[PDB]
């Protein structure tokens with residue numbers, strides 16, 4: 001699921017799944 | 030959509046929708 | 059933190075916005 | 080930043096992990 005073009009909510013979904021219990025920062029600018 | 034119990038991906042979805050182009054930090058601990 | 063505030067209890071716009079950059 | 084790397088171009092695990100806390 002990660003080695004493709006991931007945009008908007010799709011990108012945030014992948015961060016969520018990869019990061020798990022650590023969480024993440026989403027900084028699109 | 031925001032004034033309810035939001036857990037896991039549901040919570041991350043609401044942050045994404047509320048925050049828009051700013052993005053956000055998701056720090057579940 | 060967020061999970062206590064918005065999952066275990068009812069969320070608010072006010073609090074979500076605290077986590078926007 | 081992330082959008083250039085993972086939306087306009089193809090993402091990687093390596094880079095996603097850079098955004099985990």
Ligand SMILES: [Cl-]
Nearest residue numbers: 017018019020
């Ligand atoms: Cl997984």
Ligand SMILES: [Cl-]
Nearest residue numbers: 046047048049
């Ligand atoms: Cl909206």
